[PDB]
CSV table of C-alpha atoms and ligand atoms in Angstrom, one decimal:
chain,number,residue,atom,x,y,z
A,1,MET,CA,58.3,103.7,105.5
A,2,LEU,CA,56.8,100.4,104.2
A,3,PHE,CA,58.5,98.6,107.1
A,4,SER,CA,55.2,99.4,108.9
A,5,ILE,CA,53.6,96.6,107.0
A,6,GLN,CA,56.4,94.0,107.3
A,7,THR,CA,57.2,91.8,110.3
A,8,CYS,CA,58.4,93.8,113.2
A,9,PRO,CA,62.1,93.3,113.6
A,10,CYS,CA,61.6,92.0,117.2
A,11,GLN,CA,59.2,89.3,115.9
A,12,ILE,CA,61.9,87.7,113.7
A,13,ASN,CA,63.2,84.8,115.6
A,14,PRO,CA,65.4,82.2,113.8
A,15,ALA,CA,65.1,79.8,116.8
A,16,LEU,CA,61.4,79.4,116.4
A,17,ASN,CA,59.0,78.2,113.6
A,18,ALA,CA,55.8,79.4,115.1
A,19,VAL,CA,52.1,78.9,114.3
A,20,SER,CA,51.0,82.4,115.3
A,21,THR,CA,51.9,84.9,112.6
A,22,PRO,CA,54.5,87.4,113.7
A,23,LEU,CA,53.2,90.9,114.3
A,24,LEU,CA,53.8,93.8,111.8
A,25,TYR,CA,56.0,96.7,112.9
A,26,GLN,CA,52.9,99.1,112.9
A,27,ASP,CA,51.2,96.7,115.3
A,28,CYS,CA,54.2,96.1,117.6
A,29,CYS,CA,57.2,98.4,118.2
A,30,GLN,CA,56.3,101.4,115.9
A,31,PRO,CA,53.9,103.0,118.4
A,32,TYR,CA,56.7,103.1,121.0
A,33,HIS,CA,59.3,104.5,118.7
A,34,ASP,CA,56.9,107.1,117.4
A,35,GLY,CA,55.6,107.9,120.9
A,36,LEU,CA,59.0,108.8,122.4
A,37,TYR,CA,59.8,110.8,119.2
A,38,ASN,CA,56.7,113.0,119.5
A,39,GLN,CA,56.0,113.0,123.2
A,40,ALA,CA,52.8,109.1,126.9
A,41,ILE,CA,52.9,105.7,125.3
A,42,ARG,CA,55.8,103.7,127.0
A,43,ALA,CA,56.9,100.1,127.2
A,44,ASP,CA,55.0,98.4,130.1
A,45,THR,CA,57.8,95.9,131.0
A,46,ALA,CA,61.6,95.6,130.7
A,47,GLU,CA,61.1,92.7,128.1
A,48,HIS,CA,58.9,95.0,126.0
A,49,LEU,CA,61.5,97.8,126.3
A,50,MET,CA,64.3,95.5,125.2
A,51,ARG,CA,62.3,94.4,122.1
A,52,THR,CA,61.7,98.1,121.2
A,53,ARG,CA,65.4,98.8,121.6
A,54,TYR,CA,66.4,95.8,119.3
A,55,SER,CA,63.9,97.1,116.7
A,56,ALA,CA,65.4,100.5,117.0
A,57,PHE,CA,68.9,99.0,116.2
A,58,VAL,CA,67.5,97.2,113.2
A,59,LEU,CA,65.6,100.2,111.9
A,60,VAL,CA,68.4,102.7,112.8
A,61,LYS,CA,66.6,104.9,115.3
A,62,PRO,CA,69.5,105.9,117.6
A,63,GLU,CA,67.5,108.7,119.3
A,64,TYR,CA,65.3,105.9,120.7
A,65,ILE,CA,68.3,104.0,122.0
A,66,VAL,CA,69.7,107.1,123.8
A,67,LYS,CA,66.3,108.2,125.3
A,68,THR,CA,65.6,104.7,126.7
A,69,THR,CA,69.0,104.6,128.4
A,70,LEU,CA,69.2,105.6,132.1
A,71,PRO,CA,69.0,109.5,131.9
A,72,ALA,CA,72.3,109.9,133.9
A,73,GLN,CA,74.2,108.0,131.2
A,74,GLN,CA,72.7,109.6,128.2
A,75,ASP,CA,75.3,112.3,127.8
A,76,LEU,CA,77.9,109.6,127.9
A,77,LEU,CA,76.6,107.9,124.7
A,78,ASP,CA,77.9,108.8,121.2
A,79,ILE,CA,74.8,108.8,119.0
A,80,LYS,CA,76.8,108.8,115.8
A,81,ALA,CA,78.7,105.7,116.9
A,82,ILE,CA,75.4,104.0,117.8
A,83,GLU,CA,73.9,105.0,114.5
A,84,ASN,CA,76.8,103.6,112.5
A,85,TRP,CA,77.0,100.3,114.4
A,86,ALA,CA,73.3,99.8,114.1
A,87,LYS,CA,73.4,100.4,110.3
A,88,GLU,CA,76.5,98.2,109.7
A,89,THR,CA,75.4,95.2,111.7
A,90,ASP,CA,73.5,92.7,109.5
A,91,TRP,CA,70.7,92.0,112.0
A,92,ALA,CA,69.0,88.6,111.7
A,93,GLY,CA,66.6,88.3,114.6
A,94,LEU,CA,65.8,88.2,118.3
A,95,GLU,CA,65.2,85.4,120.8
A,96,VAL,CA,64.1,86.4,124.3
A,97,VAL,CA,65.4,83.6,126.6
A,98,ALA,CA,64.1,84.9,129.9
A,99,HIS,CA,62.4,87.8,131.6
A,100,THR,CA,62.9,88.5,135.3
A,101,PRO,CA,60.4,91.4,136.0
A,102,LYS,CA,61.1,91.3,139.8
A,103,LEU,CA,64.9,91.2,140.0
A,104,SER,CA,64.6,93.8,142.8
A,105,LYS,CA,62.0,96.3,144.0
A,106,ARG,CA,63.0,98.5,141.1
A,107,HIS,CA,64.9,96.4,138.6
A,108,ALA,CA,64.3,93.7,136.0
A,109,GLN,CA,66.4,91.6,133.7
A,110,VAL,CA,66.0,90.3,130.2
A,111,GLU,CA,68.2,87.5,128.8
A,112,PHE,CA,68.2,87.4,125.0
A,113,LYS,CA,70.1,86.4,121.8
A,114,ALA,CA,70.4,89.0,119.1
A,115,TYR,CA,71.3,87.4,115.8
A,116,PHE,CA,73.4,88.8,113.0
A,117,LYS,CA,75.0,87.6,109.7
A,118,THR,CA,78.7,87.6,109.0
A,119,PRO,CA,80.8,86.1,106.2
A,120,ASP,CA,81.1,83.2,108.5
A,121,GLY,CA,77.4,82.6,109.0
A,122,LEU,CA,74.5,83.3,111.5
A,123,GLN,CA,76.0,84.5,114.9
A,124,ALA,CA,74.3,85.7,118.1
A,125,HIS,CA,75.1,88.1,120.9
A,126,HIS,CA,74.0,86.4,124.1
A,127,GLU,CA,73.2,89.1,126.5
A,128,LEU,CA,71.8,89.6,130.0
A,129,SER,CA,70.5,93.2,130.3
A,130,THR,CA,69.4,95.1,133.3
A,131,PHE,CA,66.7,97.7,133.5
A,132,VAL,CA,65.6,100.2,136.2
A,133,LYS,CA,62.1,101.7,136.8
A,134,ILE,CA,62.1,105.4,137.4
A,135,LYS,CA,59.0,107.6,138.3
A,136,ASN,CA,58.1,110.7,136.2
A,137,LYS,CA,58.8,114.0,138.0
A,138,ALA,CA,55.4,114.8,136.5
A,139,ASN,CA,52.8,112.3,137.6
A,140,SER,CA,52.9,108.9,139.4
A,141,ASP,CA,53.8,107.2,136.0
A,142,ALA,CA,57.1,105.3,135.8
A,143,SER,CA,59.1,104.1,132.8
A,144,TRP,CA,61.8,101.5,132.4
A,145,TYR,CA,65.3,102.4,131.5
A,146,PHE,CA,68.3,100.4,130.2
A,147,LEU,CA,71.4,100.3,132.5
A,148,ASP,CA,74.3,100.6,130.0
A,149,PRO,CA,77.2,98.5,131.4
A,150,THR,CA,79.6,99.7,128.7
A,151,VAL,CA,79.8,103.5,129.5
A,152,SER,CA,82.7,104.6,131.6
A,153,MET,CA,81.6,106.4,134.8
A,154,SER,CA,83.2,107.6,137.9
A,155,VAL,CA,80.3,107.1,140.4
A,156,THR,CA,80.7,107.4,144.2
A,157,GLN,CA,79.6,104.0,145.7
A,158,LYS,CA,78.0,105.3,149.0
A,159,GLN,CA,76.3,108.3,147.4
A,160,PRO,CA,72.7,108.2,146.1
A,161,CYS,CA,72.1,106.1,143.0
A,162,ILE,CA,72.4,107.6,139.6
A,163,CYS,CA,68.8,106.4,138.9
A,164,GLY,CA,67.5,108.8,141.5
A,165,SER,CA,66.0,106.1,143.9
A,166,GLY,CA,67.7,107.7,147.0
A,167,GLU,CA,69.3,104.3,147.8
A,168,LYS,CA,73.1,104.1,147.8
A,169,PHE,CA,74.5,103.3,144.4
A,170,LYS,CA,76.1,100.1,145.8
A,171,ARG,CA,72.6,98.9,147.1
A,172,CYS,CA,70.9,99.9,143.9
A,173,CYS,CA,72.0,100.1,140.2
A,174,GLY,CA,75.6,99.3,141.3
A,175,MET,CA,74.5,95.8,142.2
A,176,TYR,CA,74.0,95.2,138.5
A,177,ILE,CA,76.4,97.6,136.6
B,201,LIG,CL1,81.0,110.1,135.2
B,202,LIG,ZN1,58.3,94.6,117.8
B,203,LIG,ZN1,69.5,102.9,141.0
């Protein structure tokens, strides 16, 4: 509970000694985690979504990780396995290398390093993640969703994309996963 008043996990960056004080969890990712849990407050950009996901790994909020994954993939995730992996990894920070908000009409990328500690020392996962913007079936509002490249799927290439865009999978999310 008192993580609210400590540095937000996404604000811990071993690659930077900054002048500006890193934001507290309550002032950074917590509104987004709490929002999705109770509800609509949503990440405005793919970079912001990626940060909130990282903080959900560190703080062990696997529900948030599932619900911010492309809806068509969510039933393919194993929330218990996510929960365990999140808990057992000794997270040590986040460095956002680059944000590509206009990768396509409906996609964005975020390149980042997620740091962790091992017997051997400080290590990093260097990742390039892809996100898709999907409209609510509710109002003209849209949200960003993570395209999980690790889940096994048997998708038909010429059929409509799993994101619901109406574009062929191969001319849409299949370009990137
Ligand atoms: Cl499938
Ligand atoms: Zn944060
Ligand atoms: Zn798509």
